[PDB]
RNA sequence: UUGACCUCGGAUCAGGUAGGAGGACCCGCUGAACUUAAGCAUAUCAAUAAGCGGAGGAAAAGAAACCAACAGGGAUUGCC
RNA sequence: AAGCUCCUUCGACGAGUCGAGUAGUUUGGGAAUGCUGCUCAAAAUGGGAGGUAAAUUUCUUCUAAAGCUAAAUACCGGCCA
């Protein structure tokens, strides 16, 4: 399965543990700036789509309005507090509202949320 | 759902005049076969039989029904002289004989 | 809101009105140059949604393309071309948008909207000082303006696989041999 | 390149008829040409057939026409002999 | 499939599939007035008011292409026939 | 109500030809006395032919409705009538797409 | 008279062949043939999917038709025929499969375009009373009124409507005659060939109450819907697996 | 007579701006044939090479007229 | 100046653009996979896509023709190491 000219579209992964160390650090200048902040947002538990795989769960992108606001956290403090908030997903059925607020109060029981200024 | 006093009713009300003794046989030109196909064929999955059958059926009608129709009067046999469009283009037949001819000629190209 | 008025006339392009300022406007552009300088949009409810406003530093060259095909046809479009030829004779301007605005059998007549980046008014003024940056010049010559995203089919969906996040890319992308080091 | 008539070919029913088909193999019944009307009209194709390109309109239509009253003379002189044969 | 409570859902500002805005639909009427008609609509107003309603459904057809289309822009004329006439 | 099956004065097929002849090349029956066949199994014959005089006034002069098509129905050459000139006429000028 | 028929009886028939939007090449090969053989019938261009099936009826209404036959694709894959008579008369909805159309250079045969064909019939239309209104139906679809003048004067096919399996075989033949050895008729494939499997009769143009129902008839989606379960199973056995073999690892 | 407005012009007018180079990677246009296989032709090489235009430290894309048929997912990009 | 809450009041959303026909090219992709030229040329409980034999075209899911945006990705060129 050569009948292109694959010579010239060939690549080499020799810099694997290079990268690994440049993602690290990456990583590791996030928590400078982020000092006591988590490098990452809280993201809701979501089911996955297909038959396959819908006896799973997983991350999704961020926390819809509804149960945002069942948990007590207002929309324009969320993304402010490190919470990610998605516009775009409905909730549909009460088993995936109670498991984000459920999430979003074990948030806020292990937050330390400084003054403003 | 088999309403049959329904099906019948509903049949009443399209059916047009077929009956022989009062329509002649250039107003339908429609045979209904005596025999039933499927009794000639005894597996469906047999290409060469079911096609067989299908043929034989439809034989029947046209024999049957060149008979009618030249007791009624009606032209039969296309003269000819008489040219005019087909279903099927000349193009079309003509890649239909080209391929005849390849086949025929690869078979006896085998036994030269 | 004359604006709402002017969107449902533009919507009607054959009637009498519309078809009585059309030939005759289609003759007067007739008259003056290929590409010229016009002073006010024809259109202002048109170039006002596409992004001009009444500031220094926008302004409006309309041009008319020769029409039909090269029967190859060409992948790029009219409009496309239209907005090229007036970026060339403007070389300190830069293209926004552009509009339809006549057609007649000959020639196609459109309207190019362009933003001065040099000028102050429109580097003091956020929500136009991102075309000041180096990373926008001659946007219709790279297909970044709207007819350059409908030529290069910049959509999502299934019925896009080939050709959005780039053609030439995903093709390479799609025919290049990785070998990682633990194979 | 093999003749057609050597292998075995069905014959496709096209703009010009089939008509009535022969079994191969069989008797294919000689139709005698021996009257003068029929011998016209076939001496009237082959004339037309080698003298082949005419660059007039009116004398290429002329050479059409002696056919058709070739066939005609023809149609109508076997027509009589139909009915000679019927009647008496 | 699996058993979930199902749950009402705050009805979305996306839908256009309720009461449409009446300032569009006066805009629209007026600006038919003003703009007059395409010589294509003149046709159908021709044919509607001879009767000839097959026609225009025909002609509208040919010329915009789809069958409700031409079902709207029939229906469209035929509210400015009524209307030309309750105003005459 | 019930639909009437007629062809309407507007139809493609309103007006039918005798000729019972598809879109065939008219090259066929060029040596024949007849021109098609009609729907009855009976065939068209020819009309008659033209004077070879006429013929020459014709080619040097041509006539208004002059086509250079021939008629299937009958082998002489179709040409066009006034009503339909005029309607050449109104629509490569498109000064009355139609009357009053 | 405007019924272009020159007969003594007027047996008046117009057909409406109609296509839907998503109908495929091999679909619109198979509904140009079937067009080419009625005279009395006119094409239709795609139909919209959103639209109501009683749009049809002042559809065909516009152009004085009194059948339908309705294409109607589902996928791009799969297709449905409907038979109708257009105000109020029955209405019987197939699934159409194994598509032969024309041009396919194995057919051999050929016959006049309009030509008046001779209907083979099979005797189990005369006797299921389901079976007798979708041969009606096929008369009036496929009659050819004697008198028409789009027809031809010669009769050189035959269209054949068989019943084998709980469908219906369509096949088109010609008429070929050969001399008698010391004339006989045979016949060669022309035309299309598929199989029609009746899903429901109702009575009405394109609604109405149900007469007829298949209750065996087998969807293709519903085949395809088996194959993904079928996957989806096979990965939950595995899931399963591994389960019970760790539960057992720890044991 | 005077004065507005519109449109179009002049000026070595006051202040600016573009061209060229580079082009490894990037965005477009245009665009082959050797070669491979097959009665032939389409196909393959390749939506590649050559040619033209336009950027940056990345570019391009990008916040659904999307995926899905789910107990649902939720801008773009890249690896498996 | 700003966030919310409530409501006997309102709630504007992109046209020679979709779309139909046709020609060329392109894709694994005639429900045309996409693009371009030409002819015609729209809508507002609208429009697009999909699911569905399930009895009518019900149901699901988005909102095109205006625009901006770091990061993970590429790098035979530039400054170095």
Known sequence: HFRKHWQRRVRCHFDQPGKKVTRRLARRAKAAALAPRPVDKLRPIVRCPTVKYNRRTRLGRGFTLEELKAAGIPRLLAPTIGIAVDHRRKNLSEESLAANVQRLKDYKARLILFPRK | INNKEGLLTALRRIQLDINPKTTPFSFHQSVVASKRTEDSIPQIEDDLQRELAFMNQALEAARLGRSLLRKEGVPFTRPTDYFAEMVRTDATMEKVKQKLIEEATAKKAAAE | ?183 | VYSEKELGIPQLNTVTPVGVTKPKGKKKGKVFVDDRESMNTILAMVEAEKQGQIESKIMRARQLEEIREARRIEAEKKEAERKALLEN | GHKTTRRVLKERPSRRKGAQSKRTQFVRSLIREVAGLAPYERRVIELLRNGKDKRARKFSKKKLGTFGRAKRKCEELQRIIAESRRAH | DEIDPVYDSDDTDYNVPVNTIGNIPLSFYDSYPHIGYDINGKKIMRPATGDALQNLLDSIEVPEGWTGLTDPNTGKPLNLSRDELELIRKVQQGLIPDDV | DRSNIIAERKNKQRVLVLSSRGVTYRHRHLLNDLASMLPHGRKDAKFDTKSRLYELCELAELYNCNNVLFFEARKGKDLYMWFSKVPNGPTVKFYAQNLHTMEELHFQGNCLKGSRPILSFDAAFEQEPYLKVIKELFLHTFGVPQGHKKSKPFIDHVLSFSVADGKIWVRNYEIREVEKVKTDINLIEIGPRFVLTPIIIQEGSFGGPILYENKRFISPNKIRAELRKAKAARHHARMEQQRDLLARKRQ
Do not use: M
Not at chain 3, 50 to 77: D, E, F, P
Not at chain 3, 126 to 133: D, L, M
């Open chain 3, 1 to 183: 809101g004359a604006l709402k008025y002017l969107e449902e006339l533009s919507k009607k392009k054959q009637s009498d009105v519309v078809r009585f300022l059309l030939r005759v406007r289609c003759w007067e552009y007739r008259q003056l140059n290929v590409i010229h300088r016009a002073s006010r949009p024809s259109r202002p409810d048109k170039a006002r949604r596409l992004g001009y406003k009444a500031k220094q530093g926008y302004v409006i060259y309309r041009v008319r393309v020769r029409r039909g095909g090269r029967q190859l046809k060409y992948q790029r479009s009219l409009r496309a071309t239209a907005e090229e030829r007036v970026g060339r004779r403007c070389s300190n301007l830069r293209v926004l948008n552009s509009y339809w605005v006549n057609q007649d059998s000959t020639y196609k007549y459109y309207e190019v909207i362009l933003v001065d980046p040099n000028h102050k008014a429109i580097r003091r003024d956020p929500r136009i000082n991102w075309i000041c940056n180096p990373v926008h010049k001659h946007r219709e010559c790279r297909g970044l303006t709207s007819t350059g995203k409908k030529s290069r089919g910049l959509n999502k969906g299934h019925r896009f696989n080939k050709t959005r996040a780039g053609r030439r890319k995903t093709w390479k992308r799609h025919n290049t041999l990785s070998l990682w080091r633990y194979r």
